[PDB]
Enzyme design. Structure first.
Site, PDB file in Angstrom:
ATOM      1  N   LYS B  75      48.927  35.247  45.568  1.00  0.00           N
ATOM      2  CA  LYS B  75      47.615  34.661  45.366  1.00  0.00           C
ATOM      3  C   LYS B  75      47.679  33.161  45.627  1.00  0.00           C
ATOM      4  O   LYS B  75      48.671  32.508  45.301  1.00  0.00           O
ATOM      5  CB  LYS B  75      47.206  34.931  43.912  1.00  0.00           C
ATOM      6  CG  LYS B  75      45.805  34.529  43.509  1.00  0.00           C
ATOM      7  CD  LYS B  75      45.595  34.936  42.044  1.00  0.00           C
ATOM      8  CE  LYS B  75      44.213  34.686  41.498  1.00  0.00           C
ATOM      9  NZ  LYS B  75      44.075  35.317  40.182  1.00  0.00           N
ATOM     10  N   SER B 132      38.038  41.878  52.308  1.00  0.00           N
ATOM     11  CA  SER B 132      38.985  40.871  51.847  1.00  0.00           C
ATOM     12  C   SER B 132      38.791  40.567  50.363  1.00  0.00           C
ATOM     13  O   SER B 132      39.635  39.902  49.754  1.00  0.00           O
ATOM     14  CB  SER B 132      38.858  39.578  52.659  1.00  0.00           C
ATOM     15  OG  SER B 132      37.768  38.763  52.233  1.00  0.00           O
ATOM     16  N   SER B 133      37.664  41.040  49.811  1.00  0.00           N
ATOM     17  CA  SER B 133      37.158  40.582  48.524  1.00  0.00           C
ATOM     18  C   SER B 133      38.214  40.729  47.429  1.00  0.00           C
ATOM     19  O   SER B 133      38.232  39.929  46.489  1.00  0.00           O
ATOM     20  CB  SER B 133      35.892  41.336  48.134  1.00  0.00           C
ATOM     21  OG  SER B 133      34.955  41.365  49.201  1.00  0.00           O
ATOM     22  N   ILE B 153      43.226  36.695  33.615  1.00  0.00           N
ATOM     23  CA  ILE B 153      42.708  36.295  32.319  1.00  0.00           C
ATOM     24  C   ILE B 153      41.509  37.162  31.913  1.00  0.00           C
ATOM     25  O   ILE B 153      41.286  37.371  30.716  1.00  0.00           O
ATOM     26  CB  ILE B 153      42.433  34.775  32.298  1.00  0.00           C
ATOM     27  CG1 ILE B 153      42.102  34.277  30.906  1.00  0.00           C
ATOM     28  CG2 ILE B 153      41.370  34.352  33.312  1.00  0.00           C
ATOM     29  CD1 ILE B 153      42.436  32.802  30.710  1.00  0.00           C
ATOM     30  N   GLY B 154      40.713  37.630  32.894  1.00  0.00           N
ATOM     31  CA  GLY B 154      39.586  38.531  32.654  1.00  0.00           C
ATOM     32  C   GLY B 154      39.547  39.679  33.657  1.00  0.00           C
ATOM     33  O   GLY B 154      38.477  40.191  33.954  1.00  0.00           O
ATOM     34  N   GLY B 155      40.720  40.092  34.157  1.00  0.00           N
ATOM     35  CA  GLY B 155      40.862  41.283  34.974  1.00  0.00           C
ATOM     36  C   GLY B 155      41.280  41.059  36.422  1.00  0.00           C
ATOM     37  O   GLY B 155      41.272  42.040  37.151  1.00  0.00           O
ATOM     38  N   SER B 156      41.689  39.850  36.868  1.00  0.00           N
ATOM     39  CA  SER B 156      41.860  39.645  38.312  1.00  0.00           C
ATOM     40  C   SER B 156      43.118  40.305  38.887  1.00  0.00           C
ATOM     41  O   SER B 156      43.344  40.203  40.085  1.00  0.00           O
ATOM     42  CB  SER B 156      41.824  38.198  38.713  1.00  0.00           C
ATOM     43  OG  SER B 156      40.493  37.700  38.620  1.00  0.00           O
TER      44      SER B 156
END
Lengths: 376, 403
Positions: B75, B132-133, B153-156
């Site tokens: 990432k 690509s999202s 932190i919230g699902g990534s």
């Protein structure tokens, strides 16, 4: 000259003694000696003898746990099921749970400092368990001539040691009269396995002066003695480096954070707490400090320093943290630090503290052990 | 699909291929998909081929580090030495990472080849599902690379993996160093929540990555699970039938293999209160983003009290895990189709399923369990603190059984 914990354990395993005998003998020593040294403030002698009996049964059933039958006490701040804590504990602290699972017998609890260090120094028990509340493991160990590990922050769970979360300065840690004892305690207490000792150190920073307090010649000389012994064994000792964090600022930041813990402890001081944004900035600076120490440890394998500025030194119902300066060198960044006795001066113990990089607890113990061997 | 990372590594070790070849092939696959999937937004192909050459030398010298020659991306939020990290310099050279993030350092030391960096996952309502999202998840799903590295932190990690049909581990809080990683918009108060973790197309791949990334050794997988709690409903949001059915499918598979599946227990922590406490902590973490969050900052005593309640929550989960071995739940309320892992508010209901594991710091693996309506659907497997390897193993069992 009482035997070490590991020695007592192996003697019980080999049938040279029993847990019951060791517990009986330790009780006798406490009753004999605690008359004059009031260390064991909470006694649990009857339950202890029964637990010693249980451990003996375990031994005969072939059990091989590393502290089986070894008597010990712990600081009074640890919950032990059925004993009071400053209120009766309904469960053991995690650290106490682990010690019992390894077979140790908890005879009772020692008063808050150095209770633990006094119990060790007087020979009452071979193992103890303290907590770093303003150098409360290292400074007593230094004052009393025993060994203490202030572990890496977060290495050992402080659950059951006194409303719940870990605090950014506090750690719990083992105390003993032996480095092998410290190492075995660490391995029993650690939440996850700690890195094993690497090679002997090749370079060390020795420091003897802290900007926040004057250090006595005796404490300075002790560090110098250790430095010279290491040099004589072919280890390079430096006395200055550009990578040494600013100790004055570090000590200031440490005192700020320490004062939060004590302000929070009393509602009358709740008004004087910093605001949240200040607190978050303090936590960022602490994190940066840890990384700065990590950079220093790219150049040296250990830092040796005084544990404290000195040797061992009302109708009313402390703001002065400079005596904690030397403790705060390791405490603020969360680095491991071992205090090792290196002799007596003026009839009183003097030690040195060995600080290593984060998670290099085993190296701190090994380098402390090396210093001890070289200083006789 | 393309081979797994461990399959690639064994093929390099056995002499069936080389790191250079694998890196050449991965470059070609990325370039091949330039039309449709632009997930690889920072490319380092030349240095990668030279690093592949280095890995080949290592192999020849008898080294068997477990990811030697395996290509991957990470990432864009991770520092990679010599690639841009936005440091705020109004010049180019100032914004170049001078060192790898610790996790990247560990991956490279284990022999992985970092070809480049993937876009941060796109937000809810911005969506291989999504092209690509999905970022890391899209690079995996399209077969560009077998390994990826995300942060959550919230699902990534979990939710893109679910949307895209790949695997992700959201590890135990603190298991892996987040040095060299930055959650945009945060102020240090994200620290109790955020984790970095591996992503792959294989549970064995996740397990090997975890062992390489972990600061300290994580407990080994214990026995197979004997009892599992399956939950399909969260008080803060309605869950789509398809996500519910996926959990049900997994539950039935486990039951059919003789594992006891329960649907309720007195020991389940209160998810409504937990979700509220999660939102509160997020509202502090991201207070730099928004004047409203800035205005509504609590005092220090309240903050410290929230941290104590979080610690208590973790222990409440621990008590649950004295009776069950795992919890299976939706990764998210839907399938595919200020910024907190894609949402605009700390109190967004779409974080509900992420918060179940995030707030207490528990490990959670997302595993694909098939397709519905022509889109991937997965399940999240939550285990006790530090039982990451069990989450992966139980996820793997679910996957095997739902074939």
């Amino acid at each position: 000259r009482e035997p070490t914990a590991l020695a007592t354990a192996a003697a019980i395993r080999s049938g040279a003694t029993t847990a019951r005998a060791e517990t009986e003998a330790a009780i006798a020593r406490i009753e004999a000696l605690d008359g004059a040294i009031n260390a064991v403030v909470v006694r649990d002698f009857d339950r202890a003898l029964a637990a010693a009996d249980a451990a003996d049964a375990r031994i005969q059933a072939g059990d091989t746990a590393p502290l089986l039958g070894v008597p010990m006490t712990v600081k009074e701040a640890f919950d032990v099921e059925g004993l009071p804590t400053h209120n009766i504990a309904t469960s053991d602290a995690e650290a106490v749970r682990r010690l019992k699972a390894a077979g140790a017998i908890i005879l009772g609890k020692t008063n808050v400092p150095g209770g633990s260090a006094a119990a060790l120094a007087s020979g009452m028990v071979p193992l103890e368990l303290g907590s770093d509340i303003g150098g409360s493991i290292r400074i007593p160990a230094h004052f009393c001539g025993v060994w203490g590990l202030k572990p890496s922050w977060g290495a050992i769970s402080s659950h059951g040691h006194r409303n719940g979360a870990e605090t950014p300065l506090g750690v719990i840690g083992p105390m003993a009269r032996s480095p092998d004892d410290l190492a075995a305690m660490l391995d029993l207490l650690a939440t996850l396995p700690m890195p094993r000792a690497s090679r002997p150190p090749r370079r060390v920073l020795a420091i003897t002066d802290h900007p926040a307090i004057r250090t006595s010649a005796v404490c300075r000389d002790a560090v110098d003695t250790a430095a010279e012994a290491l040099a004589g064994a072919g280890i390079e000792v430096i006395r200055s480096t550009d990578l040494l964090p600013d100790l004055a600022r570090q000590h200031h930041a440490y005192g700020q954070m320490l004062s939060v813990a004590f302000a929070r402890s009393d509602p009358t001081l709740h008004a004087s707490l910093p605001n949240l944004l200040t607190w978050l900035s303090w936590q960022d600076a602490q994190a940066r400090n840890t990384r700065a120490w990590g950079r220093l440890f790219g150049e040296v394998d250990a830092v040796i320093a005084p544990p404290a500025a000195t040797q061992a030194f009302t109708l009313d119902i402390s703001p002065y943290d400079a005596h904690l300066a030397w403790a705060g060198v390791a405490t603020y960044p969360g680095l491991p630090a071992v205090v090792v006795p290196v002799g007596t001066a003026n009839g009183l113990p003097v030690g040195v503290q060995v600080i290593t990089d984060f998670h290099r607890d085993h190296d701190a113990i090994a380098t402390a052990a090396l210093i001890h061997r070289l200083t006789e």
